[PDB]
Amino acid sequence: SDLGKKLLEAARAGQDDEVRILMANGADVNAHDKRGHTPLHLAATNGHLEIVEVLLKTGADVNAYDRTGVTPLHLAAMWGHLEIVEVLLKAGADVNALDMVGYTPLHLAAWDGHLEIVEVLLKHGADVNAQDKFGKTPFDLAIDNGNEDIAEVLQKA
Amino acid sequence: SDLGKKLLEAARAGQDDEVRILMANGADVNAHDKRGHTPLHLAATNGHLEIVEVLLKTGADVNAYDRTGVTPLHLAAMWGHLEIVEVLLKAGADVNALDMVGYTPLHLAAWDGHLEIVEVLLKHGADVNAQDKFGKTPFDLAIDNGNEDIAEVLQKA
Amino acid sequence: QTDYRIFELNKRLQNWTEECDNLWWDAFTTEFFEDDAMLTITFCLEDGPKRYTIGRTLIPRYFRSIFEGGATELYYVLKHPKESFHNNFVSLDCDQCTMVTQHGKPMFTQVCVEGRLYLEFMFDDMMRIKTWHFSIRQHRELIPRSILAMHAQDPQMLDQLSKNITRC
Amino acid sequence: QTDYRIFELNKRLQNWTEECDNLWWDAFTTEFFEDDAMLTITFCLEDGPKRYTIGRTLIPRYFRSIFEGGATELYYVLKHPKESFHNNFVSLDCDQCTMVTQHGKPMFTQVCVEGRLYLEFMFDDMMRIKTWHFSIRQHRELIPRSILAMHAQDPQMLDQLSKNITRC
């Protein structure tokens, strides 16, 4: 509750020492704000790898979805955070998880334009054929946002 | 009243034929709006010389002052209307009339930068020494607004 | 009044610095867009087809990208927009919208992307954007007059300053 | 909210055309300024002294003059203004104000005059400007990149395009 908030704040600001004080003072690691963002969502968006690892280790839900159906793996993939994408898949993050729009992580990485992040998702069995609300595939999104390397790859599966 | 308005409108839009229909239908030529603008103020600002002449002829007050103390001669001088400045002086317009700010016509012409308009005012006995609310003279205003011809002249009186 | 909302949007964008984190773009998108918002950009018909259509999760990532270019300044200028009212929502159709960005520290280029912007807004307390469609006609780039003085006598440097740094 | 008032002011200025009469400038000044308003402009300290101080009767004539230059477009950009409240009035101190004008049909130059704008506003229903002080730091002129492409090979025409068309 009270501690709930401080731990979202600290997870956001990548404040490693302050995440430990709170977790030791009993902060809920599956605490959520009005959006349905968890520490994991926040740390995964701002690229805070060490906080991702330690939250996952203390039972943070790898597959927690916000009110828009968005998971940390969606966010890591969209914002182009390689190491966090790898750590989340290993903690069991759903590679073909669907938000309210029908976006998968692959869709979001196809957009962001991170070459390796796409291959890691494809290696972990991302659906090359997944259609968002607008009938667009990761392929399509990579043409749209002008990532022609990524689209070569996506033309293979 | 009702007709009052149509005659301000027509005086503004320089609509010569519509000023005659109204004057013939009894429109008050010293009619005024919320500002205290008369047909004469309006026609003198938009440069409508013929309407100025015909209003002056049917008893329009040459020296009517709006709520800010502003006369048609102030307005003609500020907007750079030579023929209207000449017609107003001949109908007896006060050449050294003061608004709420202490502006004379000469101050306003000193600003506008109309070389002849200044000399006509000076010929008609404009005060070269008149000080606005800010202690500025027509001279000063012509330096301020970068009219160095006008200021040569004003350095003489 | 919809026009206040795009003023407030330009005002928020002023607070952006290289120092701002990715979650700033989410809080920004939460203030001005609905949870199910849609955003379409149709690009100059001098190029090929080109047409973003993205939902809410990608909108933070779209706006961020405008400043990945070197843009350090973004505002939308709406000349003579049409407000219309309906059952659930208000439309704002602006045929003369300019998206203005300024590149560089110091400023070395301004980019004006001119087109029609259509917005639908929720008619509630929050007045957030349901729909955003910007169909671009053209883009022009302006450079300081000073840069031209500088390189007057450098055919090669004038040849490079001739070239657009963006596509639209 | 004072910031809405300068949005409304930029919005009104959009309605200006060569086709507008001198009394449009009076109606404009009545909507945004008090009957006893004061307007000060302090010009670039690279030149001499230069300092307009004018009362209400000259304010219509001031704004008109901005478009006598060839300017067909005027708006004020306020980056991070400070609203403060007092007994009779609200202050708005904006250290990062840009006065933007665009010259020509078609546009051939944009003029940015950057300085501090201080406003005092009547705190009543009308929220009109009691006081207007703009102390200018600098001005820069931007030209289309296209104009530079055009005259690449014309030393003389590039020498003329080098020169500022305004002073501030």
Residue numbers in the entry:
A (entry chain F), B (entry chain F): 38 to 194
C (entry chain A), D (entry chain A): 30 to 197
Reproduce text from the manuscript describing this model:
The Chip/LIM-domain binding protein (LDB)–single-stranded DNA-binding protein (SSDP) (ChiLS) complex controls numerous cell-fate decisions in animal cells, by mediating transcription of developmental control genes via remote enhancers. Chip/LDB and SSDP both contain N-terminal dimerization domains that constitute the bulk of their structured cores. We recently discovered that Chip/LDB and SSDP form a stable complex called ChiLS (Chip/LDB-SSDP), which binds to NPFxD motifs within the nuclear Wnt signaling factor Pygopus (Pygo) and Osa/ARID1A, a chromatin-binding subunit of the BAF transcriptional coactivator complex. Here, we report the crystal structures of the DD of SSDP and XLdb1, in the latter case with the help of DARPin (designed ankyrin repeat proteins) chaperones that mask a hydrophobic surface patch of the DD required for its SSDP binding.
Screening LDB orthologs from different species, we found that Xenopus laevis Ldb1 (XLdb1) yielded the most stable protein after removal of solubility tags. XLdb1 is closely related to human LDB1, but we did not succeed in obtaining diffracting crystals with this protein either, largely because the DD and DD-LCCD undergo nonspecific aggregation over time. None of 35 selected nanobodies facilitated crystallization, but we obtained DD crystals with 5 of 15 selected DARPins that diffracted to 2.0 to 2.59 Å, depending on the DARPin. Remarkably, each of the 5 DARPins (despite their different sequences) recognizes the same lateral surface patch of the DD, perpendicular to its dimerization interface and facing outwards. This patch is highly hydrophobic (e.g., Y81, I83, and L87 engage in direct DARPin contacts), which explains why its masking by DARPins was crucial to prevent nonspecific aggregation of the DD via this patch (called “hydrophobic patch,” below). The DD adopts a cone-shaped α+β barrel-fold, composed of a long, highly curved antiparallel β-sheet (formed by β1 to 6) whose cavity is filled by 3 α-helices (α1 to α3) that run roughly parallel to the β-sheet. This structure is capped by a short C-terminal extension at the apex of the DD, formed by 2 intertwined α-helices (α4 and α5) that contribute to the dimer interface. The whole dimer interface is extensive (burying ∼1,500 Å2), which explains why the DD dimer is highly stable in solution. None of these 5 DARPins bind to the DD-LCCD nor to the assembled ChiLS complex. Since Y81, L87, and R90 are direct DARPin-interacting residues, this implicates the hydrophobic patch in the interaction between SSDP and the DD.
